[PDB]
Design an enzyme around this catalytic site. Sequence first.
Site, PDB file in Angstrom:
ATOM      1  N   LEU A  33      53.100  18.141  42.202  1.00 13.31           N
ATOM      2  CA  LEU A  33      52.725  18.898  41.007  1.00 13.31           C
ATOM      3  C   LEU A  33      52.267  20.323  41.312  1.00 13.31           C
ATOM      4  O   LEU A  33      52.158  21.144  40.401  1.00 13.31           O
ATOM      5  CB  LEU A  33      51.676  18.138  40.185  1.00 13.31           C
ATOM      6  N   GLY A  34      52.027  20.621  42.585  1.00 11.03           N
ATOM      7  CA  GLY A  34      51.539  21.939  42.969  1.00 11.03           C
ATOM      8  C   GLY A  34      51.696  22.273  44.436  1.00 11.03           C
ATOM      9  O   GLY A  34      51.543  21.413  45.308  1.00 11.03           O
ATOM     10  N   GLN A  35      51.983  23.543  44.697  1.00  6.46           N
ATOM     11  CA  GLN A  35      52.253  24.033  46.041  1.00  6.46           C
ATOM     12  C   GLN A  35      51.235  25.076  46.472  1.00  6.46           C
ATOM     13  O   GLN A  35      50.857  25.946  45.686  1.00  6.46           O
ATOM     14  CB  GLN A  35      53.664  24.629  46.109  1.00  6.46           C
ATOM     15  N   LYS A  81      45.162  15.780  47.011  1.00  3.55           N
ATOM     16  CA  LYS A  81      45.304  17.030  47.766  1.00  3.55           C
ATOM     17  C   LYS A  81      45.408  16.754  49.254  1.00  3.55           C
ATOM     18  O   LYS A  81      44.706  15.888  49.784  1.00  3.55           O
ATOM     19  CB  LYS A  81      44.135  17.983  47.530  1.00  3.55           C
ATOM     20  N   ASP A  85      34.476  30.697  40.390  1.00  6.21           N
ATOM     21  CA  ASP A  85      35.798  30.980  39.801  1.00  6.21           C
ATOM     22  C   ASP A  85      36.053  30.182  38.515  1.00  6.21           C
ATOM     23  O   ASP A  85      37.089  29.529  38.352  1.00  6.21           O
ATOM     24  CB  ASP A  85      36.926  30.791  40.828  1.00  6.21           C
ATOM     25  N   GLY A 140      48.075  23.560  51.761  1.00  8.47           N
ATOM     26  CA  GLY A 140      48.313  22.161  51.419  1.00  8.47           C
ATOM     27  C   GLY A 140      49.107  21.967  50.140  1.00  8.47           C
ATOM     28  O   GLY A 140      49.722  22.910  49.635  1.00  8.47           O
ATOM     29  N   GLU A 141      49.092  20.737  49.624  1.00  5.83           N
ATOM     30  CA  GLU A 141      49.851  20.359  48.425  1.00  5.83           C
ATOM     31  C   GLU A 141      48.993  19.562  47.449  1.00  5.83           C
ATOM     32  O   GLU A 141      47.930  19.063  47.817  1.00  5.83           O
ATOM     33  CB  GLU A 141      51.063  19.508  48.797  1.00  5.83           C
ATOM     34  N   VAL A 142      49.470  19.442  46.210  1.00  7.13           N
ATOM     35  CA  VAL A 142      48.832  18.595  45.205  1.00  7.13           C
ATOM     36  C   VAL A 142      49.854  17.643  44.594  1.00  7.13           C
ATOM     37  O   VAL A 142      50.918  18.068  44.153  1.00  7.13           O
ATOM     38  CB  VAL A 142      48.160  19.415  44.060  1.00  7.13           C
ATOM     39  N   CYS A 148      49.526  27.327  50.239  1.00  3.81           N
ATOM     40  CA  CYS A 148      49.765  27.809  51.600  1.00  3.81           C
ATOM     41  C   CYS A 148      48.980  26.981  52.624  1.00  3.81           C
ATOM     42  O   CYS A 148      49.289  27.003  53.819  1.00  3.81           O
ATOM     43  CB  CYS A 148      49.401  29.299  51.711  1.00  3.81           C
TER      44      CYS A 148
HETATM   45 CL1  LIG Z   1      47.697  17.012  39.364  1.00  4.18          CL
HETATM   46  C1  LIG Z   1      47.273  17.100  37.594  1.00  4.18           C
HETATM   47  C2  LIG Z   1      45.949  17.871  37.418  1.00  4.18           C
HETATM   48  N1  LIG Z   1      44.882  17.291  38.309  1.00  4.18           N
HETATM   49  N2  LIG Z   1      44.284  16.134  38.215  1.00  4.18           N
HETATM   50  C3  LIG Z   1      43.398  16.030  39.217  1.00  4.18           C
HETATM   51  C4  LIG Z   1      43.465  17.142  39.952  1.00  4.18           C
HETATM   52  C5  LIG Z   1      42.829  17.580  41.053  1.00  4.18           C
HETATM   53  N3  LIG Z   1      41.913  16.793  41.625  1.00  4.18           N
HETATM   54  C6  LIG Z   1      41.640  16.989  42.932  1.00  4.18           C
HETATM   55  C7  LIG Z   1      42.274  16.206  43.907  1.00  4.18           C
HETATM   56  C8  LIG Z   1      41.983  16.372  45.262  1.00  4.18           C
HETATM   57  C9  LIG Z   1      41.064  17.349  45.651  1.00  4.18           C
HETATM   58  C10 LIG Z   1      40.429  18.140  44.687  1.00  4.18           C
HETATM   59  C11 LIG Z   1      40.713  17.959  43.331  1.00  4.18           C
HETATM   60  N4  LIG Z   1      43.100  18.782  41.574  1.00  4.18           N
HETATM   61  C12 LIG Z   1      44.018  19.560  40.999  1.00  4.18           C
HETATM   62  S1  LIG Z   1      44.321  21.079  41.694  1.00  4.18           S
HETATM   63  C13 LIG Z   1      46.015  21.368  41.085  1.00  4.18           C
HETATM   64  C14 LIG Z   1      46.123  22.551  40.132  1.00  4.18           C
HETATM   65  N5  LIG Z   1      47.534  22.923  40.039  1.00  4.18           N
HETATM   66  C15 LIG Z   1      48.230  22.064  39.065  1.00  4.18           C
HETATM   67  C16 LIG Z   1      49.715  22.363  39.106  1.00  4.18           C
HETATM   68  O1  LIG Z   1      49.929  23.770  38.839  1.00  4.18           O
HETATM   69  C17 LIG Z   1      49.216  24.692  39.721  1.00  4.18           C
HETATM   70  C18 LIG Z   1      47.723  24.354  39.740  1.00  4.18           C
HETATM   71  N6  LIG Z   1      44.670  19.140  39.901  1.00  4.18           N
HETATM   72  C19 LIG Z   1      44.393  17.929  39.380  1.00  4.18           C
HETATM   73  C20 LIG Z   1      48.326  17.652  36.836  1.00  4.18           C
HETATM   74  C21 LIG Z   1      48.846  16.919  35.769  1.00  4.18           C
HETATM   75  C22 LIG Z   1      49.891  17.419  34.989  1.00  4.18           C
HETATM   76  C23 LIG Z   1      50.425  18.671  35.273  1.00  4.18           C
HETATM   77  C24 LIG Z   1      49.915  19.412  36.343  1.00  4.18           C
HETATM   78  C25 LIG Z   1      48.868  18.910  37.122  1.00  4.18           C
END
Ligand SMILES: Cl[C@@H](Cn1ncc2c(Nc3ccccc3)nc(SCCN3CCOCC3)nc21)c1ccccc1
Length: 265
Positions: free
Chosen positions: A17-19, A39, A128, A23-25, A21
């Site tokens: 869901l996210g990229q 993450k 932030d 790590g990843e999400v 520099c």
């Molecule tokens: Cl991944 C989810 C949003 N989400 N839910 C929990 C969570 C979450 N919890 C978390 C997990 C491990 C360590 C620290 C915090 N962190 C993040 S950060 C991702 C933000 N990112 C989302 C995609 O677009 C660029 C920005 N986003 C999160 C999501 C759902 C639908 C569409 C996009 C993202």
Amino acid sequence: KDAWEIPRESLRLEVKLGQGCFGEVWMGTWNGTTRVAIKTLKPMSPEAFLQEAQVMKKLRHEKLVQLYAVVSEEPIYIVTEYMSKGSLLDFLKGEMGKYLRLPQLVDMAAQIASGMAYVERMNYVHRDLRAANILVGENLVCKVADFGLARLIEDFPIKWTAPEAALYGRFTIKSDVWSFGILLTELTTKGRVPYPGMVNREVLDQVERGYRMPCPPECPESLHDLMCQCWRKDPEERPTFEYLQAFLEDYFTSTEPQYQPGENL
Ligand SMILES: Cl[C@@H](Cn1ncc2c(Nc3ccccc3)nc(SCCN3CCOCC3)nc21)c1ccccc1
């Protein structure tokens, strides 16, 4: 080791869901049942990374994204509750934007204020606060994210940053209050960039001279007044988050009892 530690085979990374520099999400599943966000640290940042998620182990609040689990040996994985709607910024800009009116937006602001009131009473500083860093789930639930970990990974949002923090490095709960005022304009404009048409340098020079954004269209003057309280030159004059929460929670009875829906708010 630690009760937050989980085995690597209990985590299934499904949709990326996210990229980044560093790590990843990912969205995924934990123990085959629990929907989660994940993450990863790219083996990038030192093992000081875990000092930040140690905070996430300490902080617990209904309006802060909840840590679920960790894989603390490299390659590191951090697991939290899943926020189904992504960032507030994307939520406000997308398909849901046109349906949200003042009652929904002020309730969302109240939730964010409640999360930030917890941060305030725990003596933390976010640094932030803005719509891109708020997460949204079902039923319009809004939460503050991993502000400490995100701050570490991030090592320029000056449109959201209080002048004293941006100029002299004085980041306090009060400069967070300034950011919250800017976040209020994001809510009431459905995600528009603040100070429209102004570059970073213009914003700094103007805000110094006492310029503040005007009342957004259809936004009641009383809410713009609240923003103006948040944007006071003296940080100690800005309201607490405890005050902001209470004001926003009571808004449609105590402050705008005669509110009528309009075209956009
Ligand atoms: Cl991944 C989810 C949003 N989400 N839910 C929990 C969570 C979450 N919890 C978390 C997990 C491990 C360590 C620290 C915090 N962190 C993040 S950060 C991702 C933000 N990112 C989302 C995609 O677009 C660029 C920005 N986003 C999160 C999501 C759902 C639908 C569409 C996009 C993202």
